[PDB]
């Protein structure tokens, strides 16, 4: 089989086990309360989610 | 700097001329009158306006 030379391994931990659900980046993922978003993407969609900057 | 704001002065002067015989030299009476005669919702702004009106009353009574 030649298709087996393109599939990735199913990792369950490490930096490679989590991707942003909006841009697909690895790395700075916010894992709080089940969010899966980069620190970059969270800033520009936070008002739509109901967050506010009170202080 | 305790500098009074422009719109406070403007509204206070407008209220004073419209009802000259409505305000006294007592802060509480003026506070209630300002509360009832306008649509102001901020408690701070009401106090500023009432204080300036009190000053105006005592200043005109003295005759400048």
């Amino acid at each position: 089989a030649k298709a087996d030379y393109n599939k990735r391994k199913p990792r369950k931990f490490g930096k490679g086990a989590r991707r942003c659900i909006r841009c697909g980046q690895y790395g700075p993922i916010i894992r709080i309360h089940g969010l899966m978003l980069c620190r970059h993407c969270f800033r520009e969609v936070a008002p739509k989610l109901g967050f506010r900057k009170y202080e | 700097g305790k500098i009074r704001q422009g719109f406070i002065k403007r509204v206070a002067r407008e209220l004073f001329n419209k009802y000259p015989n409505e305000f006294t030299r007592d802060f509480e009476h003026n506070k209630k009158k300002v509360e009832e005669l306008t649509n102001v919702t901020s408690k701070k702004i009401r106090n500023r306006i009432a204080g300036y009106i009190t000053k105006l009353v005592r200043m005109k009574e003295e005759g400048k």
Binding site: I21, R22, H33, G34, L35, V45, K48, L49, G50 | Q5, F7, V11, E14, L15, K18, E36, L37, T38, N39, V40, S42, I45
Partner: protein, 196 residues
């Protein structure tokens, strides 16, 4: 616990809204609403050209329902299409319209002035439009159009002014369009009236 439930629902709406915004661009998309009923979900879509959304007697609404049920987590969806309430008071719609007008080939000054004229005619207190990109040459530039009353900073600017942003893809690159509009019913803190 309870916090995880609220966050999970908010993300679904954000993803669906972005997908529809990218998908229904030619139909003048203007937001959505999701309501939960014991039978399923009522999904209301606001647009300016419902014909494009429906797409010649079905064949597009069914596709959208299938995509929503499969790709996203909506159960038993049911899509209704309505009309935008105040198109000239919505900044997103106007920004997208200006971007499309630019993509057609109109000079940016004409588009900006036409948009401002229409918006002010339909009863708005103030409007501002900003256009940035490679306008008239290879050195980038920004221009700004304005008239009326508009509050830039503080809490009232956050909660009263409507804002919108859009991208225009031309032959030479992208052009950014920003629009801000103040509704006619907005009242600033220092506007006090004397009761007669």
């Amino acid at each position: 616990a309870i916090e995880r439930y609220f966050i999970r629902e908010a993300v679904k709406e954000m993803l669906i809204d972005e997908f529809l915004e990218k998908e229904l661009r030619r139909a003048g998309y203007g937001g959505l609403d999701i309501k939960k009923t014991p039978l399923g979900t009522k999904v209301i879509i606001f647009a300016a050209n419902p014909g494009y959304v429906i797409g010649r007697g079905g064949r597009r609404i069914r596709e959208l329902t299938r995509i929503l049920e499969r790709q996203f987590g909506l159960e038993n969806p049911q899509i209704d299409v309505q009309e935008i309430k105040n198109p000239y008071l919505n900044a997103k719609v106007q920004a997208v319209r200006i971007a499309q007008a630019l993509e057609r080939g109109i000079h940016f000054r004409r588009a900006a002035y036409a948009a401002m004229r229409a918006i002010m005619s339909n009863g708005a207190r103030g409007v501002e439009i900003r256009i940035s990109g490679k306008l008239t040459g290879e050195r980038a530039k920004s221009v700004r159009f304005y008239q009326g009353y508009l509050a830039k900073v503080g809490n009232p600017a956050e909660t009263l002014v409507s804002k919108g942003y859009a991208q225009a893809l031309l032959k030479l690159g992208v052009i950014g369009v920003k629009v801000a509009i103040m509704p006619p019913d907005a009242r600033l803190p220092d506007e006090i009236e004397i009761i007669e």
